[PDB]
Design a protein around this ligand. Structure first.
Ligand code: HEC
Ligand code: HEM
Ligand code: HEM
Ligand code: UQ6
Lengths: 109, 373, 17, 64, 236, 21, 76
């Protein structure tokens, strides 16, 4: 009935309270730490895979090496053209002086 | 929430049997692997080209220069091997515990296998080594066996008179798609199963004892994922070439061939079967049946008990089947000479006779012993 | 929840390095 | 002096290699024993070779 | 013939390649094997290792002028090389090699060890296993009997003899010492990451030894509840 | 505390990375 | 879903708190003896086939070996 059967003895499984809980949490904490440690390693290297009056240029180091006698969006300034006798970038109208200084337009530096 | 309802319906509040053993982990492992194979395949595809001109090279570059390439490439190869290990154990679980009575799940299943097999050939042929080249020609020629339209089909696939760049580039796409393809077919798998729920090792109706999946079979799947990752990383970081054939590192000799040519282990037996049948066509057919015999399996169940937990004679026949499957895997490796051939011929005869004849007769006998028949 | 923002930030710095 | 030669010699001295060599010697002698025969001895040669070689590796690399 | 076992040091599970030897084997390749073989996929940058740092590699990088540089038309060989310069090739065209190799082909040896079943052993054996042809031996063209060689008609000319070359380190250049040393280098090049990896594998074993019992303990926590569940049937 | 549990764990993973690396 | 699954009646199901039960019951100590029992029970039906196999492999290898083995007498 309601009271005929008392709860069976689980002592066999029973452990000797917050301390027990803390230990178990500590375990989860360490494991999470382990997962995270691996994460930084894996993700980093994971991402790491994708990691590696006239002008003249010789494409030094894969970029135009202007040598003469765009800060804006990266086009090639056209030498011997423009309103400042230096350069002009047909992309957005940046005029560079012979010194290569941006004088007019939207080129930042 | 209509997106969280499906996720809850399939992974959190799904009623699962409380007594399913570790085997039942393996299918989830397969899903994790597919993910791994695919993601690895992406990076493998990155920094890679389908050009016989640069395919073998950039890959060597992956092995040599690509940032952590050696790691992603050998993770991809040994993850394909781990995929086939988990696939074989998943199919063996389905055969042993009578899970083939879920017929739609099994058929999505049997198809899934053929597909995975192909992705292997795909991934295999792609590095353009000596072994890849001579392996591709071999199986592509398998198709030529077709009675009337064979020649055309072979030439179609090859895209020319003989496998050459035309093949490499197209095989590349299938090997980029079949993975996506199989992935979806698996999704079908999960649906056709939740309609019926998973089976238990006793083979009985487990409706009286079902538990949630989130706290009970999730941490179990996480532990199985951790163990599978341990085996995969000790396969990659310690013995990266115990399962491959060194021939791979040989740029394909369009002209020369490997004195010893062997299909990879996962299919070794498959070809073992072919080697056995004298007739070319016969071999191709038997080969196909080898995989297809499984699909045929739900119509051969003649027992009143679903699982083999309480069926000892069919347990003995099952372990004899696993035994001569291992024998066929060994024979494929052995060269063509006595007595490897005879074993191959018998082993194939015993394989087809155990699956086709011996197990239903044994199930009838077992039903007779329990005063049921 | 307040500390979660903080927790994430801490781990973020670590991971991002 | 190549330690390889020395070690090879030493291993040969090993009674095991000595007996393996005995086989080879008997067999190479057999090579010359008959003409119309096909006593190539490659098999016995290889037999001794591997046996001795095992011994060699067993005690060569360290010298190396 | 099945090549027997060999106690390669680097092969040790957690141990790594001995660069000193590797270095010595790169010398051996540079002075002997490069006349018919070339580490194409290997570059002086790839060559970098304790055996040869980029600096030393640079010396070697500058040590060559063959096909390192092209001319007005990029033909023949026209200029020396630098760090990025890839390893020089004994032949600018396959035919060249074929021509200067009995018509046969001296394979570049970049991945040679990986290519050969039991390569490291094979290599050592082939280079030092010509042995003796007891009978029925008809070497046709520039061949060399070698039971270790599949056909005993290697045609890989035996290029190493006692003091075949002279090791800069001074370690006696015995055929075997030479063979073993170059072997190391060849192995090193075939897997420029052998050492890199084994360190990962050690970290992986330590992390799995930490993480497997802890995840097992969690699982057994959350599964203890059921594993202690006591069922009782109490028909009224 | 749950939140601190995660917090200390994140920090634990943070330092462990450096130490293990 | 949970609920509406099976008409199970009168099946009291006692249980104990996870943090209350010993955290990690000895597996080697208690479980493996039974595991041994479990494995020994089935192995008696599992290894027999493999017992046969190993034999096949062994015999085959040596047999094939002898097959290759040439007899000096052959063509002598
Ligand atoms: C002066 C000539 C010459 C030198 C020096 C030489 N080789 Fe070769 N090697 C050849 C030729 C010619 C072939 C082509 C043989 C063939 O294709 O049948 C060859 C082929 C090979 C092969 C292919 C055999 C196989 O298993 O497929 C290997 C391996 C090889 N050599 C290793 C070496 C090693 C190792 C060294 C030195 C440490 C070396 N060779 C030095 C001429 C040379
Ligand atoms: C859509 C996802 C995938 C992509 C993009 C992909 C891409 C590639 C690429 C580029 C390669 C060549 C690089 C290499 O040599 O390793 C390759 C090789 C391979 N892939 Fe895949 N793959 C994918 C999924 C799979 C799957 C699911 C399998 C398993 C069935 C698989 C099995 C292989 C195998 C066996 C190789 C040969 C590895 C070797 O060289 O030894 N791949 N994959
Ligand atoms: C693409 C490869 C496959 C994947 C990714 C896959 C994945 C899964 C997953 C995640 C489950 C649910 C978990 C489980 O039941 O243990 C499952 C169940 C199942 N799969 Fe597969 N599976 C694949 C191939 C196969 C094949 C080839 C077969 C047939 C031999 C098969 C037969 C089954 C069966 C019978 C079940 C239900 C078993 C049960 O719960 O009692 N699967 N599969
Ligand atoms: C009986 O309980 C279940 C269960 O209910 C489900 C849904 C799955 C499916 C679980 C998965 C994690 C699916 C496989 C994982 C993938 C990543 C699938 C990959 C395929 C894609 C298209 C992505 C199980 O493996 C499982 O048994 C443990």
């Amino acid at each position: 009935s309601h009271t005929d059967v008392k709860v069976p003895d689980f002592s066999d499984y029973r452990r000797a309270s917050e301390a027990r809980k803390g230990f178990s949490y500590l375990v989860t904490a360490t494991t999470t730490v382990g997962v995270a440690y691996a994460a930084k390693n894996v993700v980093s290297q994971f991402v790491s895979s994708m990691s590696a009056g006239k002008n003249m240029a010789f494409k030094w180091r894969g970029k135009p090496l202007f040598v003469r006698h765009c800060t804006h969006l990266g086009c090639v300034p056209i030498a011997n053209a423009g309103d400042f006798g230096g350069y002009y970038c047909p992309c957005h109208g940046s005029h560079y002086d012979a010194s290569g200084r941006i004088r007019k337009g939207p080129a930042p530096l | 929430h209509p997106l969280f309802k499906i996720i809850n319906h399939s992974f959190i509040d799904l009623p699962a049997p409380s007594n399913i053993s570790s085997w039942w982990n393996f299918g989830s492992l397969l899903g994790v692997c597919l993910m791994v194979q695919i993601i690895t395949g992406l990076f493998l595809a990155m920094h890679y080209t389908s050009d016989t001109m640069t395919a073998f090279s950039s890959v060597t570059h992956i092995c040599r220069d690509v940032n952590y390439g050696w790691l992603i490439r050998y993770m991809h190869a040994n993850g394909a091997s781990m995929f086939f290990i988990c696939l074989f154990l998943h199919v063996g679980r389905g055969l042993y515990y009578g899970s083939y009575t879920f017929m739609e799940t099994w058929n999505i299943g049997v198809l899934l296998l053929f597909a995975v097999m192909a992705t292997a050939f795909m991934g295999y042929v792609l590095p353009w080594g000596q072994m890849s080249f001579w392996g591709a020609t071999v199986i592509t020629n398998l198709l030529s066996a077709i009675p009337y339209i064979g020649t055309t089909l072979v030439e179609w696939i090859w895209g020319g008179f003989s496998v050459d760049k035309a093949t490499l580039t197209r095989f590349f796409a299938f090997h980029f798609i079949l993975p996506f393809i199989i992935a979806a077919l698996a999704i079908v798998h999960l649906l056709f199963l939740h309609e019926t729920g998973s089976n238990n090792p006793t083979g009985l109706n487990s409706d009286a004892d079902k538990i949630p999946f989130h706290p009970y079979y999730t941490i179990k799947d996480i532990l199985g994922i951790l163990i599978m990752f341990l085996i995969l990383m000790t396969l990659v970081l310690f013995f990266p070439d115990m399962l491959g054939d060194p021939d791979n590192y040989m740029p394909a000799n369009p002209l020369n061939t490997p004195p010893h040519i062997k299909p990879e282990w996962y299919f070794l037996f498959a070809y073992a079967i072919l080697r056995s049948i004298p007739n070319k066509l016969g071999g191709v057919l038997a080969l196909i049946l080898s995989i297809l015999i499984l699909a045929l399996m739900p119509f051969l169940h003649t027992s009143k008990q679903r699982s083999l937990m309480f069926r000892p004679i069919t347990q003995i026949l099952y372990w004899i089947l696993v035994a001569n499957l291992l024998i066929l895997t060994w024979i494929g490796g052995q060269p063509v000479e006595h007595p490897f051939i005879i074993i191959g011929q018998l082993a194939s005869i015993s394989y087809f006779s155990i699956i086709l004849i011996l197990m239903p007769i044994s199930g009838i006998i077992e039903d007779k012993m329990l005063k049921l028949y | 929840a307040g500390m979660w923002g903080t927790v994430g930030a801490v781990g973020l710095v670590w991971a991002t390095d | 002096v190549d330690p390889l030669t020395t070690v090879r010699e030493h291993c040969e001295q090993l009674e095991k290699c000595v007996k393996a060599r005995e086989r080879l010697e008997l067999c190479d002698n057999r090579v010359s024993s008959r003409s119309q025969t096909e006593e190539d001895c490659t098999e016995e040669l290889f037999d001794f070779l591997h046996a001795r070689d095992h011994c060699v590796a067993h005690k060569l690399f360290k010298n190396l | 013939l099945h090549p027997p076992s060999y106690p390669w040091s680097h092969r040790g599970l957690l141990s790594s390649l001995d660069h000193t030897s590797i270095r010595r084997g790169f010398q051996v390749y540079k002075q002997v094997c490069s006349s018919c073989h070339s580490m194409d996929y290997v570059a002086y940058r790839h060559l970098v290792g304790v055996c040869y740092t980029e600096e030393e590699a640079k010396a070697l990088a500058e040590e060559v002028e063959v096909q390192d540089g092209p001319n007005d038309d990029g033909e023949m060989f026209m200029r020396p090389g630098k760090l990025s310069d890839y390893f020089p090739k004994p032949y600018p065209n396959p035919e060249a090699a074929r021509a200067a190799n009995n018509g046969a082909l001296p394979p570049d040896l970049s991945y040679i060890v990986r290519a050969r079943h039991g390569g490291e052993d094979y290599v050592f054996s082939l280079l030092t296993g010509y042995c003796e042809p007891p009978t029925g031996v008809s070497l046709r063209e520039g061949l060399y009997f070698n039971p270790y060689f599949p056909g005993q008609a290697i045609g890989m000319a035996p290029p190493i003899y006692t003091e075949v070359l002279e090791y800069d380190d001074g370690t006696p250049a015995t055929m075997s010492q030479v063979a073993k040393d170059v072997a190391t280098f060849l192995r090193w090049a075939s897997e420029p990451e052998h050492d890199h990896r084994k360190r990962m594998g050690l970290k992986m074993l330590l992390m799995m030894g930490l993480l497997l019992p802890l995840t097992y303990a969690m699982k057994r926590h959350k599964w203890s509840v059921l594993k202690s569940r006591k069922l009782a049937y109490r028909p009224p | 505390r749950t939140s601190t549990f995660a917090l200390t764990i994140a920090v634990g993973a943070l330092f462990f990375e450096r130490a293990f690396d | 879903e949970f609920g509406n699954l099976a008409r199970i009646r009168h099946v009291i199901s006692y249980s104990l708190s996870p943090f209350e039960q010993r955290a990690f019951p000895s597996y080697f100590s208690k479980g493996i003896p039974n595991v041994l029992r479990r494995t020994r029970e089935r192995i008696l039906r599992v290894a027999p086939p493999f017992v046969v196999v190993y034999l096949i492999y062994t015999w085959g290898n040596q047999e094939f070996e002898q097959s290759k083995r040439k007899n000096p007498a052959m063509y002598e």
